[PDB]
Amino acid sequence: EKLEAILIPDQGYHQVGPADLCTDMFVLSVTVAFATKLEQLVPSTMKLSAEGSEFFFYYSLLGNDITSEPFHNLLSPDFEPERASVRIRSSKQILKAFLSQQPSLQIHLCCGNHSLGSTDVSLSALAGISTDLDNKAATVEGAFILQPPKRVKQTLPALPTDLQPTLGVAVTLRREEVALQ
């Protein structure tokens, strides 16, 4: 059988592994912290000034559709750092194995029903460093590049440096009783 995160609807947590053996509570969280150079993902300066331009981040976390607080200033992002968390009932070994087997988290920058770009954040990398969950939280954090869904990326003017659209993301796994700190 495949390891699956099974929503327990009444209680508001996901069971991973057999419920009689995997009984500890964990929190898995995603924080979108800041962004820069997002204007490269919009082909026209004119769309930046339309007020229908309202942008947000989307991702699926263990099957949960998550959207962030909409913001308007793409050139100078104004959104607040925002965390989404899910509760998991599991065991340390089974949850670490489950996470090591998950595909990367794909975080999208959206406008309306359009994805302007996405970036991959490895949950398996987080599992790989989740080696002291009895005592410490484990966190992968960095500046992740947002890639447009186009075949060809055009850059005008072409410079020696290449500042790309970037999203600061932190993904954290911890025992529920272990403070993020």
Residue numbers in the entry: 166 to 346
Tell me, in the authors' exact words, what the paper reports:
Using X-ray crystallography, we show that the ciliopathy-associated centriolar protein CEP120 contains three C2 domains. CEP120, for example, plays a key role in the duplication, elongation, and maturation of centrioles, which in principle could impact the production of a functional basal body (Comartin et al., 2013, Lin et al., 2013, Mahjoub et al., 2010, Wu et al., 2014). All three C2 domains of CEP120 (C2A, C2B, and C2C) adopt the PLC δ1-like topology II and are structurally similar to each other (root-mean-square deviation [RMSD], 2.4–2.6 Å), with major differences found mainly in their loop length. Thus, the CEP120 C2 domains probably play a role as protein-protein interaction modules.
(but not from Homo sapiens [H.s.]) we obtained diffracting crystals that allowed a structure determination at a resolution of 1.6 Å. In human CEP120, both the V194A JS and the A199P JATD mutations fall within the C2B domain. In our structure of C2B from Oreochromis niloticus, the equivalent residues (V195 and A200) point inward toward its hydrophobic core, suggesting that they play a structurally analogous role in stabilizing the C2B fold. The point mutations V194A and A199P, which cause Joubert syndrome (JS) and Jeune asphyxiating thoracic dystrophy (JATD), respectively, both reduce the thermostability of the second C2 domain by targeting residues that point toward its hydrophobic core. Our structures revealed neither complexed Ca2+ nor potential Ca2+-coordinating top loop residues or cationic β-grooves. Strikingly, other structurally characterized C2 domains engage their binding partners using exactly the same interface.
